[PDB]
Structure formats: structure tokens, C-alpha cells
Amino acid sequence: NIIXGS
Amino acid sequence: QSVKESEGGLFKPTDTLTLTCTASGFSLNGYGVIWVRQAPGKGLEWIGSAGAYGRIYYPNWARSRATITRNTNLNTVSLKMTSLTAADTATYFCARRTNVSTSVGFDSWGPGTLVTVSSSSGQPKAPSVFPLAPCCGDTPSSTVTLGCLVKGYLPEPVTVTWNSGTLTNGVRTFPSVRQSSGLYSLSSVVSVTSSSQPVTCNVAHPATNTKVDKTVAPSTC
Amino acid sequence: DMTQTPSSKSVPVGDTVTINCQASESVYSNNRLSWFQQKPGQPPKLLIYLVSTLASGVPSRFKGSGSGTQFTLTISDVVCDDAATYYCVGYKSSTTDGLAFGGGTEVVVKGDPVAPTVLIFPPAADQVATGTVTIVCVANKYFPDVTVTWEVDGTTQTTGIENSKTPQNSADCTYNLSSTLTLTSTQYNSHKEYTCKVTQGTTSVVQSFNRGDC
Ligand SMILES: *[C@@H]1O[C@H](CO)[C@@H](O[C@@H]2O[C@H](CO)[C@@H](O)[C@H](O)[C@H]2NC(C)=O)[C@H](O)[C@H]1NC(C)=O
């Protein structure tokens, strides 16, 4: 989940 | 609806820099916050980011000496940097991103805070202000440019107004230069008609809590 | 890694200019790319997010395009107000080295050429007692760039000189420059003629004063 927590 | 960086100022090499990003008119909680700096005459440089959902990420150069922390109680984001060098002299910015869906659509930027890491003297200095007037031997004309030289201050910045802000047009305030001693120097001029009363330049040096008024008259011989 | 080319470009008023941004690796979802405008002494301003969506209040003559590893900013009908440095920022992930700034592209806007008006200011009377004097030479409202030369009794000065240039005027594209010559009080009192020479290509403007007369 490396896209702003998602 | 604006963000602001806390005070920078004068640092010696090996000091620690601590800066706080504060918001007014909206929240920082739940929004991405980034730290960027800009050395004199160089490009914007990423220092690190506070993700909107808790993750903190850095560029590799900064991961060892910078740490970025969010305080959701106080609605702030902070930056701490260790082992300062003269190369860390720069303007430091924080910025807020309204929409996470943009990732880097950073929307609201602070005015920037000036950090001077001085290799030559860590002691502050209040400026001397000297009038700038044409040689008294010169023939007068209908127009005249007068000014003030703000010399020998540390750290940055100084601000200059003319006649308490009532004289604004035809004012040219130049970027500062660094003397060989390490002290900074700024110059400001203003063009008026020769019917003008004497002009007064208002110089503020916040780092020394100093305000200087200098009234400049054209010399005559 | 974001590579921006060229580092600098001059564009006539009214013409169109294109700024290039090379991402070594495709940004996330092929669209995590923003453009920024920064004028010297000011914070950056967001121009475009998601490759091509204009931020609110940004004129439509700014156009963002691209995809993958390659992006472009196009400014049509350039005005002096567009003199600035422009930056692209690409995002891959929320990890180490996972966003990058371009090195920036300085856009110089070419307006009408204007020759500088040159002013020289002898040191205030209360400077000399301090043991050091600073002589100021100002070149106002000029384009294109100038070079400044200092002479003391005909001898070209090679040390003690600092120069500072304002950014391009947002209305007429012109610069202002301040040049300072710093000497010891004795050097000042030992010489007579102080001269500042402002050269603009094939044009030169020279202002002098004689210490005895001021
Ligand atoms: C965040 O997203 C909102 C929603 O898309 C943006 O609001 C829009 O702004 C554009 C101009 O850029 C307008 O044309 C839309 O009508 C707006 N929509 C709404 C619902 O207000 C907002 O500008 C974005 N902000 C950032 C910094 O990206």
C-alpha cells in the first residue's frame, strides 16, 4: 500500500 | 487558508535545524505536507513528505539527517535536520496538498523561511544604514533618485519601505549580497521629482528587533 | 529522476514556448505529474496537476501534456508576467526516492530592448569614519543583460565588487542591477575619480564622480 496508504 | 514556516535564522555548522509548518484557515491533518528548500540561485530540492495517511518518506540524501513528524493534536508538521553545513543555507518551504488524488498537486505554499548557516561568525549583527544621494557637485534636475544602503547585517532578512509605505512607486529594492566578512548588504532606491520633501527609508531587521529610519536629502554644493 | 531541458530559454513576447520534462521512470498511473511556476524571492505556484488539469485561476494559455516518461508545458501568447522558472514534479509512490523534482527551466521573456539609466552614489559622509566605504552604482530599467566595470583613477577594479539583479519586471520585462565597490577609507581618500561602466552589447553608459566634489 505505497500509494498514500491505499 | 495558508501555511507558514516557523522562524529560521542564524546557525553555526554542526547545529540542528528545527522547523514547524503551521496552518491557518484550514487543517493539515489528513492532507499531504511537503518540505522543500532552495539554495541561493539553485533549484527546488525535496527534503521529505508527510503523507496524508501517516507514511513519512524522504529522498535518500535526507533519510539519514532529516526526520519529519506530524502532530495531529496541534495540526502541525515539523522538520528536524542535524549536522548543518554552509551548504544548508537556503529558503525552506512547506506546502499543503488539497487532494490526495493528485499526489503532487501541492496547493498552498508558505512564504518560506530563511536559514543561514554561517562558516564566518555565528553572531548576529544589526545593520548600519547609509543614505544614497547624488554627488553634491552635480547639477540638479527635475528628477532625482535617492536611496539607503543597508550594510553589515546578519542574519537575513531586512525589509525596506519608504515614507512608512506611502511612497511605493518607482521603488527598486535589490536582492542582498554577502560581503567578504560574511555580513549581508541590501540597497533600495526611489525616484521622485525634485519638488519632493526629504524621503525616509524604513529598515527592519527582525533578528535583532531593530527598526531604523533614515531621512535622505539631496546634497548641494 | 526528472530531467528538465533546456535549463534556460528566451522567448519573445507573444510567442509560444515549450518546456520539457523527462522522467527516468513512468509516474504512477501515468498521470501523477504537476507543474509549478516560481519567480525569484516568491514561493512556488501550482500551475497544472494530473498532467493537464489547470489549477484554479491559471490562464488557459498554459497547456500541460505528455505520458509515460515524457511531459511538456506549453505557454502561448507569452507576456512579461511569465518570466519565471518552471518545474515539473513526478510521483511514483509514498516511499524512499519516490517523488522527484525537475531541475527547472528558466524562461526569459524578450521585450523591447531598453538601455539602462546609470546612477552612481558616493559614500555618505558618515561611512568614512568606519574605516570602510561602499560606492553604489545602479543600472535601472534595462534589457538585455549588462556587465559592470569599476575604475579608480583609470585602474580597473578586480576585487571588492558585489552585484545584485532584480527579476524581470512583470510589466515590461526589464531588469534593475545594483553594483557595490567596497574600499578602505584610506584607499578612498587616496584617489580622486571613481567610475562605473555599464555595458550592454555595443552600448556603454559611464557615470563618474570626483571625491573632491562630493
Ligand atoms: C481538488 O479537487 C477539486 C475537485 O475536483 C477541485 O475543485 C475543482 O477545481 C476546478 C479548477 O481547477 C474547477 O473547474 C472545478 O469546478 C472544481 N470542482 C469543485 C467540486 O469544486 C480542486 O481545485 C482541487 N484542488 C487541487 C489543489 O487539486
Residue numbers in the entry:
A (entry chain M): 2 to 7
B (entry chain H): 2 to 82, 82A, 82B, 82C, 83 to 100, 100A, 100B, 100C, ...
C (entry chain L): 3 to 27, 27A, 27B, 28 to 95, 95A, 95B, 95C, 96 to 211
Publication text:
Phosphohistidine (pHis) is a labile posttranslational modification with two isoforms, 1-pHis and 3-pHis, involved in many cellular processes across the kingdoms of life. Previously, we developed monoclonal antibodies (mAbs) against the 1-pHis and 3-pHis modifications using stable phosphotriazolylalanine mimetics as immunogens. Here, we report structures of Fab fragments derived from five rabbit pHis mAbs crystallized in complex with their cognate 1-pTza and 3-pTza peptides. These structures provide critical information about the molecular mechanism of phosphoepitope recognition, isomer specificity, sequence independence, and noncross-reactivity to other phosphoamino acids.
In the 1-pHis Fabs the peptidyl phosphate is oriented toward the CDRH2 loop, whereas it is anchored on CDRH3 in the 3-pHis antibodies thus creating a deeper pocket. The key feature of phosphate binding by the 1-pHis Fabs is the participation of Arg95 in CDRH3 loop in forming salt bridges with the phosphate; this type of phosphate interaction is shared with two phosphate-binding superfamilies, FMN-linked oxidoreductases and PRTase, as well as SH2 and PTB domain-containing proteins that recognize pTyr modifications. The bound peptides adopt a type I β-turn conformation around residues I-1-pTza-GS. Analysis with PyIgClassify shows that the canonical conformations of all of the CDRs in 1-pHis Fabs are the same, and that they share common conformations with CDRH2, CDRL1, and CDRL2 in the 3-pHis Fabs. These two isomer classes of Fabs differ primarily in the conformations of CDRH3 and CDRL3, which also provide the primary contact points for the triazolyl group. However, the direct and water-mediated hydrogen bonds formed with the N3 (N3 equivalent in imidazole ring of His) in 1-pHis Fabs and N2 (N1 equivalent in imidazole ring of His) in 3-pHis Fabs means the topography of the CDR can exclude nonisoform specific substrate binding.
